[PDB]
């Protein structure tokens, strides 16, 4: 359940969304949920 998001490009993800508390992990997907939901 710890984890944010964010939306722009830093991974890649135009047109979609990443997570990633620290910038390590840069997980991205098409749904912005997904981005809190799956990233977890």
Same mark, same amino acid.
């Given at each position: 359940?710890?984890?944010?998001?964010?939306?722009?490009?830093?991974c890649?993800?135009? $047109? &979609? +969304? *990443?997570?990633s508390?620290? $910038? &390590? +992990? *840069?997980?991205?997907?098409?749904? &912005?949920?997904?981005?809190?939901?799956?990233?977890?």
């Amino acid at each position: 359940d710890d984890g944010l998001c964010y939306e722009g490009t830093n991974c890649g993800k135009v $047109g &979609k +969304y *990443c997570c990633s508390p620290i $910038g &390590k +992990y *840069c997980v991205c997907y098409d749904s &912005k949920a997904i981005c809190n939901k799956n990233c977890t």
